Design a binder for this molecule. Sequence first.
Ligand code: NAP
Ligand code: NAP
Ligand code: NAP
Ligand code: NAP
Ligand code: DX6
Ligand code: DX6
Ligand code: DX6
Lengths: 249, 248, 248, 249
Amino acid sequence: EAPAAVVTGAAKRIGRAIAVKLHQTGYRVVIHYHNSAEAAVSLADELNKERSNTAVVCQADLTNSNVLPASCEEIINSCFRAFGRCDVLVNNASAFYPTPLVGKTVETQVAELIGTNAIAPFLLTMSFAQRQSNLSIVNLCDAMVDQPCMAFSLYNMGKHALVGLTQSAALELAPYGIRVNGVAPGVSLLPVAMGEEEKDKWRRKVPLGRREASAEQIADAVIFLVSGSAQYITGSIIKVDGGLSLVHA
Amino acid sequence: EAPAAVVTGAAKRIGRAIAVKLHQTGYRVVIHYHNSAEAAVSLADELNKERSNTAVVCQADLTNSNVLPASCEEIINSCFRAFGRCDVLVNNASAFYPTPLVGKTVETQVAELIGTNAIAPFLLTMSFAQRQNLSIVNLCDAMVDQPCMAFSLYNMGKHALVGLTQSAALELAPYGIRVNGVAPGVSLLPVAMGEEEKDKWRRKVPLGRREASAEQIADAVIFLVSGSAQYITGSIIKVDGGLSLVHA
Amino acid sequence: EAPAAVVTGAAKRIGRAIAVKLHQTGYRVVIHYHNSAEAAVSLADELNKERSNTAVVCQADLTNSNVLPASCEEIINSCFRAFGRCDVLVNNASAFYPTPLVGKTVETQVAELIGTNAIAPFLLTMSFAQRQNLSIVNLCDAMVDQPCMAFSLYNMGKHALVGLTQSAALELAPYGIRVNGVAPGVSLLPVAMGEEEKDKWRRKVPLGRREASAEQIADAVIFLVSGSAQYITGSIIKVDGGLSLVHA
Amino acid sequence: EAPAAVVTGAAKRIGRAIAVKLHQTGYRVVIHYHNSAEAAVSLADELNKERSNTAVVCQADLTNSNVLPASCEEIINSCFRAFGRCDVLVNNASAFYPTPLVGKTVETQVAELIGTNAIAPFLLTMSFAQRQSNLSIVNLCDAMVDQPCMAFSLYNMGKHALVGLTQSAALELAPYGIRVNGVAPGVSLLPVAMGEEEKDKWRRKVPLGRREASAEQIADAVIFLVSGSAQYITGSIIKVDGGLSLVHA
Ligand SMILES: NC(=O)c1ccc[n+]([C@@H]2O[C@H](COP(=O)([O-])OP(=O)(O)OC[C@H]3O[C@@H](n4cnc5c(N)ncnc54)[C@H](OP(=O)(O)O)[C@@H]3O)[C@@H](O)[C@H]2O)c1
Ligand SMILES: NC(=O)c1ccc[n+]([C@@H]2O[C@H](COP(=O)([O-])OP(=O)(O)OC[C@H]3O[C@@H](n4cnc5c(N)ncnc54)[C@H](OP(=O)(O)O)[C@@H]3O)[C@@H](O)[C@H]2O)c1
Ligand SMILES: NC(=O)c1ccc[n+]([C@@H]2O[C@H](COP(=O)([O-])OP(=O)(O)OC[C@H]3O[C@@H](n4cnc5c(N)ncnc54)[C@H](OP(=O)(O)O)[C@@H]3O)[C@@H](O)[C@H]2O)c1
Ligand SMILES: NC(=O)c1ccc[n+]([C@@H]2O[C@H](COP(=O)([O-])OP(=O)(O)OC[C@H]3O[C@@H](n4cnc5c(N)ncnc54)[C@H](OP(=O)(O)O)[C@@H]3O)[C@@H](O)[C@H]2O)c1
Ligand SMILES: Nc1nc2[nH]cc(CCc3ccccc3)c2c(=O)[nH]1
Ligand SMILES: Nc1nc2[nH]cc(CCc3ccccc3)c2c(=O)[nH]1
Ligand SMILES: Nc1nc2[nH]cc(CCc3ccccc3)c2c(=O)[nH]1
């Protein structure tokens, strides 16, 4: 019987690449999405045509609120309903936008940036563990946490809290045989609204190849961490940044 | 005239010591409190006896909610109202208790632990910078990489505080605002904790097999706000007696 | 065409497991040794039984001295003489004994601990890169920030090795050479160590309450040299089962 | 009885400013130098003029060799000889030059960069503690240690090893009442050999003030760590870099 994985924000980009690669490893996947309904349905269709009844979709908003604990519990329950088990959780969904210290209200920004990056992963970790072999959780972090982008405090705080969770959950869930790890990209798939000249500026900063990581290169590290080649690894953050975090100003 | 300082959770323990020591150095102080009104007033009385009209109190819940941004804005305004200036912000207030992954609802635990430790300091930082030797000092934790068992949300809150310290230091540097952290290991142990558990933590400490007094924590805060630290920003000073260096 | 790998201290324990797994993956291997001649030769015969002329041995002392650069140049050259190429360098050889701050002379301790853990890896890296999916893997230590009592020089050697990993990754990236690290917590425990002391360390480990097999360490090395890690440089992968996260 | 301090590389720049401030704090100082004989003697004069019998000089090469343990033993002995006590050790002396992986022999480069930045500090710490209130050691580290200069491997390795010494010695010497800390400058007094356009390039990188640290601002952090306001601080490294280490590439 095939193991099952939950991947958050899996409709497109890096989340999709992780969902695809986990499926290619033989996982049945729950494809979580928020707004991207068509891309999520289309991804599940491509994976179900490869192997029938191996991909389902699951809609949930991961913004912080008093109903968020129930939304996260349902995401996890949707895996057990469709596949009868949950072996892997991948915390990939993330809001990303500036919040300068000097549109959306601040309480909305806080709820989205901390909710998606830290609080939902915490509640998803709770539910994953409480619903319970090679069990593992993989958190999508940020290799640039110590060298943050200007005016991204709430986003930076969220990813720092995610490092804390990864270490805290690794310690506490180790007796239960659940490994908690992280993957930290530098520059991978750049924002869609980012101009090409701004893209190349960041590409030129990368020592290894002067380019960004492909989504597949991120998914490769996720797949290593969930495999039997990493059975002793827990509380480890693997940066996949091509040397970006090593370059001085 | 004299510089003014905002200290959150300043009625007792580490906050009180920071407030006293800032006052002794010549600062006028806002003593923020949530539940400890009497203690806050009695501290203010003691400081006002020393120098008239140099200490005020301020009440605010720092739990995460829809009204939190306004509460943080009024704490900062309270400093400008009393003293006409705000030079130092000390983010000391902090909820601390366990949250097992496997009583208070989880949404309330999130609101208090992430609220007091990370979100309130974020909102106070915003208000501090917006209203302008200016410095902010965040009360971190030296055991962030070696967390207490079942203290996930608290650990998440303190990790986020490190992130705020670094981000704020970067963004506020052009404005002349320095942002630093002080990370206690074991200082004044929780009032609830038992003597047995207290002495266990004390023997772990390489330096003197004792805990830090609150004023040893305050000494590091006093250094960071002074002219001796004019070039220091984005730094976190451990005050743990070597505790974080000890293996399992 | 089959790639080639140099593994230092490959006669026994972790280095042997790394040598075996690299060979099983399709690498031709230089098995470096210092004193363990019989074990190194025994491994080479084992591997050459599997595939003919795919393993050679290389004797060198990796203590710091004026002949160390020449020795490291010869180790790298032996891989080219045997196999016509050098694709992978694994710095595994390591001296490990206490050096109290308050037998060997101190200058021998400095030469041995800093030589094997830091200086030889630097000199091997120089010779590796100068001779050119190229990668280097350095054997670090997950407990580098929570060090064993009275192991100063060893801790210094391992800290310096983290420095080399980061510096070489930055500098050799234009050449397409990746430089990474594997950091074990508790793996294969010392040979003469009593099971009672062994169990004290095993009990410290959150994951499974046991030490890492040499094969589990080798697994992270195999991943870092593979095509699944072609964007990974300057990274240090902990294989410690959550040990570095446990407070005193 | 006024306390006594050893400052290595104390004839010029940061080391000199540390020696001066310590003297102003009431310490009697040993001025260690290697080649700056005129500057060291001149400094001892100035300090002895202000307060008689408070300053001596001590010449020593801190390059790694078999005689280095003896040289370090002698530097400490020189403090006990002049002042009858030794309360503070400041490890400031340091060689700083590129060692690309692809003018001196490599063996000489290894000996100077690892010797001065790591090994001599280790042997001085050993000799200091062997001869033993508020006793403390301050190691001059580097804020840019995880974001190193290109082609500075051996220097960077030496500074990394110095962080490890600071933490190891703090742990080990704690039962003896000896605190061991570090100060990590980012951009401070820029090297003499550097061009003025390079200097401005580095100055522009600094978030706080767009300038470098004066030697005195570095000395202020050293003075704090040796004082009674830091008697619970051990194994801590204080960055004095004006936020430089927080700036991404
Ligand atoms: N891309 C990079 O260069 C880079 C660099 C460093 C770290 N990372 C990390 O790696 C991961 C993947 O990166 P990425 O660039 O692929 O991320 P992304 O495209 O910016 O976001 C991934 C998904 O998150 C979901 N999401 C956003 N807000 C949500 C909300 N409020 N509730 C529920 N879902 C929400 C979105 O799903 P829907 O489209 O369905 O709404 C989105 O597709 C992220 O966690 C990121 O932080 C990426
Ligand atoms: N104590 C230690 O050994 C230690 C160790 C590591 C880190 N630290 C850090 O150092 C700082 C001070 O330590 P401490 O032990 O003195 O802290 P504490 O006693 O646990 O809390 C300090 C104050 O925070 C306020 N507070 C708590 N919850 C609040 C809420 N929901 N809204 C508004 N205010 C709230 C309280 O004020 P009211 O009484 O008025 O309600 C309390 O007096 C903290 O940030 C802590 O994380 C301390
Ligand atoms: N085992 C663990 O629990 C653990 C924990 C943390 C880190 N590590 C790291 O992982 C790596 C391997 O661990 P291990 O326990 O297997 O190592 P180890 O047995 O202690 O040493 C490995 C080899 O190093 C060689 N060596 C020692 N001194 C040498 C010298 N002066 N010149 C040349 N070679 C010398 C020896 O080769 P010969 O036999 O031929 O003399 C020895 O077999 C090491 O780098 C270690 O620091 C291991
Ligand atoms: N300046 C900065 O921007 C900066 C940045 C980061 C870290 N730091 C650290 O802060 C400390 C002070 O910096 P600095 O710029 O003042 O250093 P520096 O001027 O480059 O060197 C300090 C002293 O070290 C001595 N020295 C050099 N090689 C020696 C050897 N082989 N044996 C014995 N002594 C030797 C020299 O003494 P003599 O003149 O008598 O020969 C020199 O005066 C250093 O440890 C440095 O690594 C400085
Ligand atoms: N969720 C999310 N989180 C993120 N963290 C970092 C990124 C993109 C990396 C980047 C950051 C700043 C400028 C150019 C490229 C990113 C993203 O695109 N989405
Ligand atoms: N807010 C707050 N935050 C805190 N962090 C740590 C403490 C108490 C000291 C301590 C630290 C680590 C383990 C046990 C006890 C503490 C506290 O008493 N209040
Ligand atoms: N070279 C070498 N380096 C090492 N670092 C750490 C170890 C063994 C792990 C250990 C360290 C201290 C006490 C018990 C077990 C070890 C070893 O066995 N060999």
